[PDB]
Amino acid sequence: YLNIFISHHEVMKLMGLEADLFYVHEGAINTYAMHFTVPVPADVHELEFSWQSLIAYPLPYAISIEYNNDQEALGTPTLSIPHKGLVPQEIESFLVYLPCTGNASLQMPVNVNMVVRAPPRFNDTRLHFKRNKICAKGISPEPNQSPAPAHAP
Ligand SMILES: *[C@@H]1O[C@H](CO)[C@@H](O)[C@H](O)[C@H]1NC(C)=O
């Protein structure tokens, strides 16, 4: 009833291979793949997840993040979607932003927790995505709002 996967482009960005990876396929969790800790290079500033509900019954989701607050190398992770809502019935993708400050070099765990509530005939999908974020000094995401020369009137 539920697909959760990372696309070909996401696997190429993260790992350099041409493949996709379904972490959940029609409700079945890829427990083997969930064991792995995926490294996130210094120059990768976001993780992209893709998902799709395969039924009409509403699928509530909840997303939480695990990371050490108390350091100077990684800024606060954010989402491109609300941390709670419904899983879409068309394939959609969302981002977990992992913005390294560029003011420090460091490796650290960042884990993404997801819970998708199931209709009563199935069991909830509980996921613990393990990632190890690399940060490097002088490597940080660029802003997309561009500067403009300014002077006083
Ligand atoms: C953000 O978009 C701007 C376009 O103004 C571009 O200069 C920059 O390279 C982009 N950076 C990222 C991380 O998307």
From TrEMBL:
It comes from the Eukaryota. Glycans are attached at N144. Disulfide bonds join C100-C135. Residues 4-135 form the WIF domain. This is Derailed 2, isoform B. The lineage of its organism: Eukaryota, Metazoa, Ecdysozoa, Arthropoda, Hexapoda. The chain holds residues 26 to 178 of 648 of the full protein.
